From TrEMBL:
Domain Ricin B lectin, first and last residues per copy: 255-394, 404-535, 547-676, 685-818
InterPro entries on file: Pierisin-like_dom, Ricin_B-like_lectins, Ricin_B_lectin
A Pfam family: Scabin-like
Organism: Lysinibacillus sphaericus (Bacillus sphaericus)
Protein name: Mosquitocidal toxin
Length: 822
C-alpha cells in the first residue's frame, strides 16, 4: 500500500512501457530511500492534469524548464530519454533516485526545474546552470503530466525547484525552447507537435528575437558543442537573482499553416469552397483537406493578418467591402492591396481568438446565424457575446509519431490489434505480440504522411484498395493510397486517415472486436470504432548478456539445465555455469536464443514437435527463439517464436527439480520470471549502512573486538559503515570495514569478521539479491548458498548476533542498503 493513487506521476514517461508500472516503480524507488530522508514519502505533483478535462495544465504554476545542450532536431523528436532505458529495471541504480540527485549517476530519471515568478505573476530568473553563459545551451519549456516534487519529498542540503520525471518526457510535452549563444538568446523554437497545438502562440520571449516552428532536420535545428544531464545537476547551477527576464513582447500569430476551427463546433473548420476568384468561404466538417487550411501572414505596420488558402495560395480570406448589395459574406479573392483582406486577430480572456476586418473593424468574422450546419457561409457581422464568432487557431501537425515500430489497436479493446495474416489481408485479432502483429511507421517528410508497413512482410504496406474493395489491404509499390495521415486526439488516440481520399480513415468494421473482423476504409465520423491506439513496441526488450531466470513465485529457484536427459527445471540457485544463460538477440527472428553458459551448444528449447518439454536442444530452430515480454510487476514472460501463444513456465507452483513446461499463456505467476542480469553494471559501490527490514534503525554492526557482526541502533560509528567490494568474476561482494571482512561460519552460526581473507575465499563473499515480493535485499553467502544473513531469533536488542540461516524471507532476513561514509 501507500504508493500513488494512479499513473499520473509517470504518464509523461518517454519510456512508455513504464507508464502502467506505477506500483512497481514506487516500490523500487522507495526501498533505496530511508525513512529519515523522506518523512512522508515522495510527494508527487498535484494539479498537472485537469479534472474537468483530463488535459495537461498550461498555466504558470506548472510551467517547467529544462536546460539541455541537446538541440531540437534531436529533442523535439526524441523527447527526454533517460540515461537508462532498459526494460529489466533494477532498484540498485537504474531507479536509485537519491543517488542520481546526489551524483548524477545514470538512472531512468529526467529532471526539470520550475519557472519562477513574483507576486504579480511576472517571470523571474529560474534555476540556472553556471555553464549557461557559454556556448550552445537550450532552455526547453515543458508542460507534462506528473513529475515528482523533489523539495516536498526530501531533507538533504540542492535545487528547491527540481522536478524529476521517471521515464523521461515525450516530446509532445515540450512546447518550446530558447536557443542561447553565449548568454544571448538567438532563436525561440516552437514545437508543432506539442500536446495543445493551440497554445503555441502563447510562447513569449523578448522582441527582435525570431520565433520559428520546428520541423525534423531543420537547417538551424541542430546547433551544438563538440553527460546530457550534466547541466541540470544541482551543484552545476543555482538561482542567480530575482531579476525580470524579458517577456511578452508580441502576443501575435507567427506565420505558418493553420486551421481556424470554430468554438461552437471544433469539428467544423473554415474552408474555401473552390479554386476560382470570389468563391465563398464556408464552414465544413474538418477532414484535413488542403482547402481547410490557411497560411496566416502577419504585417508589422498594420498589426493585421492576411489569411491565404493553402489549397489555392493566391486566394485570400477576404470581405468584399466594396461590393454592392452591402454584402456581408466572406469569399476568397486575390491580393487586391485593400484592407478588407486584412484582419486583426484578438485573444479574448478565455484563450480564443476573434477576427475583425481592417477596413471596418466593427465587422467581425462569424458563422451565418451561428449555424454550424455544413456549407453555411462565413459572414462578417457586428459584435455578439455569441460563441460562433470565437475561434481556435490551431497549428497543423503532421509528424505526430516518431519513426519505429508500433502496435496499432482499437480504442474499443486495446488488446485487439491490427494483424497482417497471409501476405495481403489484414484483420483485427487478440494480441499475442507477434511480428505480423507489429507495424513500422515511417513518416514521409514531403507527403506529411506515414507508410504503415508490416514487420513480417517489409515489401507490403497497409494500403487502400481504392480500385476495388475499399477494404484495407497490404500491397507492394509506393502508391498514395498506402500513405496515411495520423492525427493525435484529445484522448491520446489517433485517427488514421488515408492520404488519397481524406474522407477515408481506418475503420474497424461495425465496431466488432470479434477475432478476425475486417478493417474498412470508411468515411470519417470519428466514432470510437475509427479511433486507434498507436503504441510503441520493441522486440529487443532486453540487452544481450548472461542471465538467470528467477521464478516470480520463488526467486531462489532459477531455470537450471539439469543432468537428467537434457531437461531444464527450476532448482535452487547456486550460481553454477549451468544455471546461467547467454541471451542473444537475433535481428532476423526478432527473438532471443537462450544458450546455456556451461554447455553453449545447448539452448533453452521447446520440444514443439513432441511434448511440452523444455530442454537444452542442440543447433538452431524456431522453437529455440524467445520473445521476452515485460510484465507490469517487473517480470518477463517469454513467448516462443514458433508458437508465440506458448511461453515457458512451470506447470503450477515451482519447487526444486521440477521441469519447465511450455504452456498456453494465461498471465498466471507460474509463467513469469525475473531476470538476473549477471553481466550487468547495477552493482553496489562504496559505503553502506545495511539496515533491517524489520527495524529500519537497526543496522549490521561490527562488535568492539572485530570478531563478529551484530544488530545495533544506527549511531553513525565506523563499525556500521560497511564497504561493498564487488567482484565481477563471482557476481558477489566482499562486505568489509578496513581489513575486517564479513565472514561465513556455517549455517546456524554467528557471522564472524575476519582480517586477512584471501581473494578467492567464498566465505568472504556475499550475493546481494533484491526480493521483489518482499521488497528487500537478501544477503546470501557465496561459499554455501543455502544461507543468508539473519538477525538471530528476530531479536533486535543491541548486540544480538547476525547469524546465517536458511532463507524464509522473514523480516529479519531482509535488508536495505543506504549509503554512508568511510
Amino acid at each position: 500500500p501507500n504508493s500513488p493513487k494512479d499513473n499520473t506521476w509517470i504518464q509523461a514517461a518517454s519510456l512508455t512501457w513504464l507508464m502502467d508500472m506505477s506500483s512497481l516503480l514506487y516500490q523500487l524507488i522507495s526501498t533505496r530511500i530511508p525513512s529519515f530522508a523522506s518523512p512522508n514519502g515522495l510527494h508527487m505533483r498535484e494539479q498537472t492534469i485537469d479534472s474537468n478535462t483530463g488535459q495537461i495544465q498550461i498555466d504558470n504554476e506548472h510551467r517547467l524548464l529544462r536546460w539541455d545542450r541537446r538541440p531540437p532536431n534531436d529533442i523535439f523528436l526524441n523527447g527526454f530519454i533517460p540515461r537508462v532505458t532498459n526494460q529489466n529495471l533494477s532498484p540498485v541504480e537504474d531507479t536509485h533516485l537519491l543517488n542520481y540527485l546526489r551524483t548524477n549517476s545514470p538512472s531512468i530519471f529526467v529532471s526539470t526545474t520550475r519557472a519562477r515568478y513574483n507576486n504579480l505573476g511576472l517571470e523571474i530568473t529560474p534555476w540556472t546552470p553556471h555553464s549557461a553563459n557559454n556556448n550552445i545551451i537550450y532552455r526547453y519549456e515543458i508542460f507534462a503530466p506528473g513529475g515528482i516534487d523533489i523539495n516536498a519529498s526530501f531533507s538533504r542540503n540542492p535545487n528547491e525547484d527540481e522536478i524529476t520525471f521517471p521515464g523521461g518526457i515525450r516530446p509532445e510535452f515540450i512546447r518550446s525552447t530558447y536557443e542561447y549563444h553565449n548568454g544571448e538568446i538567438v532563436r525561440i523554437w516552437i514545437n508543432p507537435n506539442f500536446i495543445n497545438p493551440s497554445t503555441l502562440n502563447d510562447v513569449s520571449g523578448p522582441s527582435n528575437i525570431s520565433k520559428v516552428f520546428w520541423h525534423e532536420n531543420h537547417s538551424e535545428g541542430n546547433n551544438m558543442d563538440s553527460n546530457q544531464d550534466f547541466d541540470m545537476f544541482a551543484p552545476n547551477g543555482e538561482i542567480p537573482n530575482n531579476n525580470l527576464l524579458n517577456n511578452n513582447s508580441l502576443n501575435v500569430i507567427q506565420n505558418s499553416e493553420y486551421q481556424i476551427k470554430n468554438k461552437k463546433d471544433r469539428n467544423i473548420v473554415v474552408t474555401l469552397d473552390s479554386d476560382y476568384g470570389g468563391s465563398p468561404v464556408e464552414s465544413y466538417k474538418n477532414f484535413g483537406f488542403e482547402n481547410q487550411k490557411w497560411n496566416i501572414k502577419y504585417d508589422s505596420k498594420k498589426n493585421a493578418y492576411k489569411i491565404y488558402n493553402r489549397e489555392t495560395p493566391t486566394l485570400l480570406l477576404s470581405w468584399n467591402s466594396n461590393s454592392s448589395n452591402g454584402e456581408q459574406v466572406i469569399r476568397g479573392y486575390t491580393e487586391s492591396g485593400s484592407n478588407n483582406q486584412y484582419w486583426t486577430i484578438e485573444k479574448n480572456v478565455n484563450g480564443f481568438y476573434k477576427f475583425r476586418n481592417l477596413s471596418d473593424p466593427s465587422k467581425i468574422l462569424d458563422l451565418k446565424d451561428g449555424n454550424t450546419l455544413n456549407k453555411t457561409p462565413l459572414v462578417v457581422s457586428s459584435e455578439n457575446s455569441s460563441s460562433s464568432q470565437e475561434w481556435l487557431i490551431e497549428k497543423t501537425n503532421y509528424q505526430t509519431v516518431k519513426d519505429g515500430t508500433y502496435q496499432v489497436s482499437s480504442k474499443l479493446n486495446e488488446n485487439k490489434v491490427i494483424e497482417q495474416i497471409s501476405t495481403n489481408k489484414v484483420h483485427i485479432f487478440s494480441n499475442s505480440d507477434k511480428e505480423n502483429q507489429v507495424w513500422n511507421l515511417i513518416y514521409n517528410p514531403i507527403l506529411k504522411a506515414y507508410k504503415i508497413k508490416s514487420l513480417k512482410y517489409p515489401n507490403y504496406s497497409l494500403a487502400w484498395d481504392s480500385n476495388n474493395t475499399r477494404t484495407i489491404v497490404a500491397a507492394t509499390g509506393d502508391y498514395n493510397d498506402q500513405y496515411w495521415l495520423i492525427e493525435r486526439n484529445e484522448d491520446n488516440t489517433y485517427i488514421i486517415r488515408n492520404y488519397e481520399n481524406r474522407k477515408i480513415v481506418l475503420d474497424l468494421s461495425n465496431g466488432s472486436t470479434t477475432d478476425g473482423n475486417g478493417l474498412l476504409g470508411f468515411e470519417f465520423h470519428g466514432g470510437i470504432n475509427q479511433r486507434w491506439i498507436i503504441k510503441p513496441f520493441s522486440f529487443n526488450s532486453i540487452q544481450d548478456g548472461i542471465y538467470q531466470f528467477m521464478t516470480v513465485i520463488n526467486q531462489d529457484l532459477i531455470a537450471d539445465l539439469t543432468t537428467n536427459n537434457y531437461t531444464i527445471a527450476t532448482k535452487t540457485n547456486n550460481y553454477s555455469s549451468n544455471q546461467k544463460w547467454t541471451v542473444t538477440y537475433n535481428d532476423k527472428k526478432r527473438a532471443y536464443k537462450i544458450r546455456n553458459l556451461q554447455h553453449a551448444h545447448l539452448s533453452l528449447a521447446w520440444d514443439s514437435n513432441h511434448s511440452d518439454k523444455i530442454f537444452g536442444a542442440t543447433g538452431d530452430y524456431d522453437d529455440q527463439y524467445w520473445i521476452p515480454i515485460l510484465q507490469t510487476d517487473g517480470s518477463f514472460i517469454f513467448r516462443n517464436y514458433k508458437n508465440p501463444n506458448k511461453i515457458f513456465g512451470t506447470n503450477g507452483q515451482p519447487i526444486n527439480d521440477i521441469p519447465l513446461k511450455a504452456q498456453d499463456v494465461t498471465g498466471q505467476n507460474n509463467q513469469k520470471w525475473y531476470l538476473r542480469h549477471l553481466n550487468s553494471s547495477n552493482n553496489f559501490t562504496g559505503y553502506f549502512n545495511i539496515s533491517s527490514k524489520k527495524n529500519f534503525n537497526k543496522i549490521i554492526t561490527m562488535n568492539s573486538n572485530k570478531t563478529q557482526a551484530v544488530i545495533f541502533d544506527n549511531i553513525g560509528i565506523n563499525n556500521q559503515s560497511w564497504k561493498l567490494k564487488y567482484n565481477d568474476n563471482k557476481n558477489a561482494y566482499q562486505i568489509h570495514i578496513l581489513d575486517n571482512f564479513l565472514y561465513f561460519q556455517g549455517g546456524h552460526n554467528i557471522v564472524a569478521t575476519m582480517r586477512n581473507v584471501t581473494n578467492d575465499d567464498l566465505r568472504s563473499y556475499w550475493y546481494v539479491e533484491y526480493n521483489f515480493n518482499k521488497d528487500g535485499f537478501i544477503i546470501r553467502n557465496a561459499f554455501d548458498t543455502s544461507y543468508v544473513l539473519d538477525v538471530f531469533q528476530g531479536n533486535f536488542a543491541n548486540n544480538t548476533p547476525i547469524i546465517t540461516y536458511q532463507n524464509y524471507l522473514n523480516d529479519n532476513q531482509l535488508w536495505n542498503f543506504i549509503p554512508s561514509l568511510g
